[PDB]
A paper describes a structure:
For human peptidyl-prolyl cis/trans isomerase CypA, a combination of biophysical experimental techniques has elucidated general principles of the energy landscape during catalysis. To directly observe the changes in an enzyme’s energy landscape upon directed evolution, we turned to a previously designed second-shell mutation, S99T, in CypA that had three effects: inverting the equilibrium between two states that are essential for catalysis, decreasing their interconversion rate, and causing a parallel reduction in catalysis. Here, we use directed evolution to identify mutations that rescue the catalytic activity of S99T CypA. We measure the effect of the mutations kinetically, using NMR, and structurally, using room-temperature X-ray crystallography and multiconformer modeling.
Besides revertants to wild-type CypA (Ser99), our initial screen of ~1000 variants identified a variant (S99T/C115S) with increased activity. There is a weak epistatic relationship for C115S: it decreases activity in the wild-type background and increases activity in the S99T background. Our data show that the S99T/C115S and S99T/C115S/I97V mutations increase kcat/KM relative to S99T by 3-fold and 5-fold, respectively. In an effort to determine whether the observed changes in kcat/KM are due to changes in turnover number or substrate affinity, substrate binding was detected directly by NMR titration experiments. The dissociation constants are only slightly changed relative to the S99T mutant suggesting that the two mutations function by modulating the turnover rate rather than substrate binding. Interestingly, the exchange contribution, Rex, for group-I residues gets bigger with consecutive rescue mutations, indicating that these mutations increase the slow interconversion rate from the major to minor state (i.e., Rex = kmaj→min). Although we hypothesize, based on the NMR data, that the Phe113-in conformation is present at low occupancy in both S99T and S99T/C115S, it is not observable in the crystallography data. The interpretation of increased conformational heterogeneity of Phe113 and Thr99 was additionally confirmed by an alternative ensemble refinement method. The size reduction by the C115S mutation could contribute to the faster transition between the major and minor conformation due to the relief of a clash between the larger sulfur atom and Thr99.
Author numbering: 2 to 165
Write the structure that this text describes.
Amino acid sequence: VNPTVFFDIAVDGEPLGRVSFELFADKVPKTAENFRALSTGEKGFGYKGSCFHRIIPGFMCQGGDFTRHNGTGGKSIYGEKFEDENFILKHTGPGILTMANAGPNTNGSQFFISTAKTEWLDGKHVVFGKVKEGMNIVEAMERFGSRNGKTSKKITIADCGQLE
């Protein structure tokens, strides 16, 4: 019942592999729907062609800024920002999807994929999905990051959509 979405990742335009996510629509339906719709592009905008602008090995991959490509942009399907829906789910380990934000109730389109347990984010960032297939591809992406987050190659979402 929970939706599955996929990202096809490229590295300087060269295919790397696919990552699929389960979105926890049962518990955070508003947050899950935003990511789902941005992945299909069905509202006329979304993640296809956008880059991961910040990757910190041993911490997370960050993406979703499809308007400014650097962490200063993005928007949700509900407007420029929407509310923290709940904090039911926790940052338990690698492979968690969690919203990036700039304070309370400032969710847009940016997100983190964790590559470590990040428990200090509990109750501040809204967890809304997990990596289902392709965690090995997230691990491969992580190798193009650096301590300050700058990527050594351009990591893009070459295609994305819904699998079920």
